[PDB]
Amino acid sequence: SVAHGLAWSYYIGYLRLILPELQARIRTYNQHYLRGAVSQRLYILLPLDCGVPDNLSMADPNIRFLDKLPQQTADRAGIKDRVYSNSIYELLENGQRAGTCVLEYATPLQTLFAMSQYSQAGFSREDRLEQAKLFCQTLEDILADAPESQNNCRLIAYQEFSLSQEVLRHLRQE
Amino acid sequence: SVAHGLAWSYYIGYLRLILPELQARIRTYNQHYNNLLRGAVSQRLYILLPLDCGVPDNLSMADPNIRFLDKLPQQTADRAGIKDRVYSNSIYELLENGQRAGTCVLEYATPLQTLFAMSQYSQAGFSREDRLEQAKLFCQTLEDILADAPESQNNCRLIAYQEFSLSQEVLRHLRQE
Numbered sequence: 001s002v003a004h005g006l007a008w009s010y011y012i013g014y015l016r017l018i019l020p021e022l023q024a025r026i027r028t029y030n031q032h033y034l035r036g037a038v039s040q041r042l043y044i045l046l047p048l049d050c051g052v053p054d055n056l057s058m059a060d061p062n063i064r065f066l067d068k069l070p071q072q073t074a075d076r077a078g079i080k081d082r083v084y085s086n087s088i089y090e091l092l093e094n095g096q097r098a099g100t101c102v103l104e105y106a107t108p109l110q111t112l113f114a115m116s117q118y119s120q121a122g123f124s125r126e127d128r129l130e131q132a133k134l135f136c137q138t139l140e141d142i143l144a145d146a147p148e149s150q151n152n153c154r155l156i157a158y159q160e161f162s163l164s165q166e167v168l169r170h171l172r173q174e
Numbered sequence: 175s176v177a178h179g180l181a182w183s184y185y186i187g188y189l190r191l192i193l194p195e196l197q198a199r200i201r202t203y204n205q206h207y208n209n210l211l212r213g214a215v216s217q218r219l220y221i222l223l224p225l226d227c228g229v230p231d232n233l234s235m236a237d238p239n240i241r242f243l244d245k246l247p248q249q250t251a252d253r254a255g256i257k258d259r260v261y262s263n264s265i266y267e268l269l270e271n272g273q274r275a276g277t278c279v280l281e282y283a284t285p286l287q288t289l290f291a292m293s294q295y296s297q298a299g300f301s302r303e304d305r306l307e308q309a310k311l312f313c314q315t316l317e318d319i320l321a322d323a324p325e326s327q328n329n330c331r332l333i334a335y336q337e338f339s340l341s342q343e344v345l346r347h348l349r350q351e
């Protein structure tokens with residue numbers, strides 16, 4: 001139930017607010033500059049081990065930062081012009097650019113990791129994998145009822161390895 | 175359980191990352207961006223915790239005595255693959271009988287809106303009548319976590335309430351310091 005609430009909050013508090021505006025941001029980026037073009041959809045990394053690093057090129061050198069997408073702003077809960085920033089990455093395969101996409105980790109998975117570390121959270125490391133799977137499954141179930149959000153994102157769940165090959169397999173499915 | 179996880183995530187995923195850098199941003203605003211003739215913006219993030227889980231996006235709509243003054247200088251950090259993820263926060267003037275009674279950084283705890291949404295959607299398996307108990311649990315859990323994070327606890331103030339003057343609610347907390 002910790003993961004059930006986290007998935008509902010990740011959707012209500014974030015995905016619901018950025019995914020309807022994402023297509024236009026990507027088109028605007030591609031207009032100023034097929035595979036050369038940044039692919040559509042937010043690619044969401046879901047490591048079931050709940051390991052969320054801040055730098056992607058550290059996780060896999062074949063994932064290289066290209067540019068920041070133009071930021072989205074909106075008045076949110078008293079924050080005037082709350083800023084939504086997203087990053088574009090190149091995916092390399094044997095020294096060649098094989099794909100370009102908007103990529104990030106689902107940050108609530110780091111909450112599961114931290115809760116399993118802190119005694120006061122009353123959350124055991126033995127329950128973390130089941131909770132990570134439930135977070136992913138709940139997010140999939142919600143997105144199945146939100147067509148605008150579902151078509152604007154791709155869920156990349158995995159257990160450990162090549163992170164770029166994991167992303168490319170999803171990118172090549174289209 | 176839903177609210178227990180939401181409070182832990184609001185701390186781990188947000189407060190833990192902005193509260194250690196807040197003091198410096200307020201001091202910078204006061205030294206270089208604040209109107210020369212104005213009083214200093216108070217320290218600490220004032221977090222609104224409406225137990226009814228009603229989270230509007232515009233504060234002057236909730237109470238006309240809460241007026242937007244300026245945005246604090248933004249904080250940036252590489253976060254989970256987002257290069258220079260931006261943290262923006264807003265400064266408000268609190269009016270009492272037409273005049274300035276206080277100036278502070280203010281916002282709603284957005285996870286409370288998740289409780290409201292879940293109580294509405296059938297697929298969330300969260301009964302309409304469960305909202306208040308979960309809102310109270312969110313606030314209590316957040317208070318418990320902050321009691322173990324010294325810097326963070328000193329960089330924020332929790333404003334929990336049931337409905338009314340929202341500006342008077344904030345001023346009572348501002349004046350306690």
Ligand SMILES: COc1cc2sc(C(=O)CCC(=O)O)cc2cc1OCCCOc1cc2sc(C(=O)CCC(=O)O)cc2cc1OC
Binds near residue numbers: 005008010187285
């Ligand atoms: C209100 O609920 C959420 C809001 C956001 S905003 C967000 C991002 O902007 C993605 C990048 C990041 O985590 O910095 C993720 C989430 C997840 C949310 O739900 C997960 C459960 C609650 O935990 C968090 C609460 C907040 S509140 C927050 C804010 O930026 C405050 C203003 C706002 O919500 O727009 C970030 C988080 C991040 C959280 O977990 C990662």
